[model samples]
Target: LDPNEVWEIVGELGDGAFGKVYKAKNKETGALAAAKVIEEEELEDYIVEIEILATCDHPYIVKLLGAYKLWIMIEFCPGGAVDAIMLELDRGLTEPQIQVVCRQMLEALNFLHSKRIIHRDLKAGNVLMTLEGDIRLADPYWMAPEVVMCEYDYKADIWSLGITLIEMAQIEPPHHELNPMRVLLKIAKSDPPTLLTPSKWSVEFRDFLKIALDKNPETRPSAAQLLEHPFVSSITSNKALRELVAEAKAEVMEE
Candidate 1:
């Protein structure tokens, strides 16, 4: 059904490169959704994201509910993006919470890679979560280094995933102090980034980042390979993650 007739826009969820996403309610069942509204003029540019979201059905990936005109409806993530939550809390995620997110993200990434699909934009900003703390690999925010050079393969996503882990652990991505233009040059020219303070985290976590952020794409392990790594393989539940989500939500509500 068309969102115009079935969904009521509740409030603005966030903005995207092309448009704003609104928290929408399904009038029929009272189900909530994130309606990504784009202008008609941008439909062509948006179709790629739409197609991928529509095709992907993994539990960790955000599900596309419907689309009509320029409204792209998807599952509503009440906890918002991981980056947003970190911003609100003014702290990096705990190891347990990061474990849950890492496992789920790796699973989704594996699924996509198996289908030969690369997440051109994988970062903390695209990692969404439910109130239950279920991690959902959401849409892109459009920044990549090897992608900018136009010579990357699927392994480019692995490097991005490493940066995202750093972002989760540090409350900001590597080179956050630099402007986009300079950051791009740094990423393209420098060696892979290590945690600013490696002693703060587990050895396994640091090793996982090293594997993912390998300077040579040929040496970078695939998502499936990373899934078996010590950091994520031990994750059995999202209980800790759910607590963090609840805490973040409470803090956001109090503001």
Candidate 2:
């Protein structure tokens, strides 16, 4: 199907380094979708994004429906981007909420690793939330083969995940105001932003974040292993906690 003929633009969602995204409706399927439009000059970069999405297949990762010369269509996430919501929820997430997001993200990462793909840019803004309160990875401009020679690794994604989780709990990115270059330097130098004090968060949760964000990728646990961490295991075991998180997410979606 010709994407342009099938989808009608409804509104602009946002823009980024790659291009602009618009809310659109499918003429044939009558389904809502986010249509990302790139300039003809940027086709190569767009191809890379499509390749990343094509290589990944996980519920937590964004679903790529179709693409053409300058437009890429993806599942519409009505609940919006995680970073946008996270910033507004000044109180931050409860321990249980963090658990839910963490588990889903780890599963997404594990799936990517199994496919020999590395999500080189894992961050809160790249995480999209659904109306059902599910967390999914979005924005595929930075993914690449795991074998590429680089300073980062599969563990780098985990480190970024750790930072993202911390932001969930703190209502702010770990290094809120730092320039992008400075933040990268700090991460590469094995220094993280000042962590929330123990009094501000559970000791177990704090420790889990520490390990996940560890500067030394060699010491960081694999996505599979992190799912077994005590902080995460506890959340999975508590039915009440799970229910509470689901309820909270539902409320957020309703807003």
Candidate 3:
């Protein structure tokens, strides 16, 4: 892309260890997007994200527009991160809506698993949604248990996906009530967390999460397998997702 395609860096989106993200606009189409500008010294390392994005062409995964100098252009999702949506909905989303989103996420994870890439950080904050309620997995945490000091595999993502579901349903991730290190310890020592038995959450949905959150990494179900679960397979379209997104967007604006 011409350096000018990223016609303007409007504002800082967020900054992290790699670099800063900014709200960028296409000079020609007037379309908006997210631009990540990595540090020159660490450019080689960070470029992996853009490369991974380039390799991906899925509807549920973020699209890579192009790379220019230190900046990489990615499609912007106006619906904001799913975590924000969780915060906005105190009672949590309907099971059907969550199912649609779960299906979309399963598709994205299925694609990445096929590519042999693990999304260590698969939290709601990393799951962004479009105005139409389509979801894209992004902002990987790179903090998988196996990643820290071992040969990590795709199963690591299943664990995080379980955490993401907990966040969506409970409005907080597992161990959110504990200290960071304590939470880590719990995750490491426990048999993986489970949803409360008394909740109105359906059996299919809870069982779906059970396999993904299995603490024994070797035992965790792959994304492909999880996709077949009743919870995810039952979802047929983005209709539920779109309705939720439209309502959430309106609520955010009204607030």
Candidate 4:
């Protein structure tokens, strides 16, 4: 159960709401991993994330390699989180690239929902990418109106997914200009958010967002259902996503 016996913490990757993540190396194989170091006092707070990671098993979901008292070791995604990569570029990802991301994320959500586990938040920041350009759904954060209202279900993620789609297309979520708390009120009071430049997106994508952002949670489709959406169901290759990753990597090198 000792992390030090097998993994050597090499550098700080980033910090989350609950812990600091470190770049770790396997002592024997030299494989890389992300070690989430939760402080002793926060161990209880981290159990849910640890448990979810342990229970989830899907190619599109981040893999949990090992867990100790206050540490969780997960697969290392060298390409980094999607939001970080997008922030480096002046424009958002293309429709084809977003389609690939949507497909992979829906696959992950379907898996989680099948197990009766709902990811409370699904955002660009929580979507990580591998060096090969495939996606691995990661940590969840943020809140939804139904969640704040104390009555929610898996459908909440669909709404968040819609927002994430907007985030991917425009580099910001809807109502992002508003104060955080103010946006919460707006989300609760107004109609569902839609793309600001709807004419620029494909009809399939617009329709997908329309269904995904349905204000009525009961009417919102499940992750599996969303997979059947024309936007996601369309045949695709990972080439666009791979190119995006390559561009991000080159940018990183130049910096």
Q: Candidates 2 and 4: which is better by lDDT?
A: 4
Count of clashes in candidate 2: 1
RMSD of each: 5.1, 5.8, 5.0, 4.8
Q: Find the number of clashing residue pairs for candidate 3.
A: 0
**TM-scores for the candidates:** 0.90, 0.82, 0.87, 0.91
Residue 74 miss distance in model 3 (angstroms): 0.5
Task: Candidate 1: list runs displaced more than 4 Å.
Answer: 1-3, 40-42, 140-152
Which candidate, 2 or 3, would have the higher TM-score against the true structure? Answer: 3
Candidates' lDDT values, in order?
Answer: 0.85, 0.74, 0.78, 0.85
- What's the TM for model 4? 0.91
Candidate 2, 51-138: lDDT as tens digits? 7787776788989988864788899987677666655443676777777788888889888888877887777778787756677788
Positional deviation of 161 in candidate 3, in angstroms?
0.8
Error of 3 at 75 (Å): 0.1
Error of 1 at 206 (Å): 1.2
Which lDDT tens digits does candidate 1 get at residues 1-255? 545778899899767675788899988899999888765556776887788778899899999998785888899888889898998999998888888888998898889988889887889889998887798888645969857667437887888888898899999888889989898799889888999898889999888987888887766788888889999987888998889889897998883
What's the residue-level lDDT of 114 in candidate 4? 87
Worst 10 residues of 1 by lDDT: 143-152
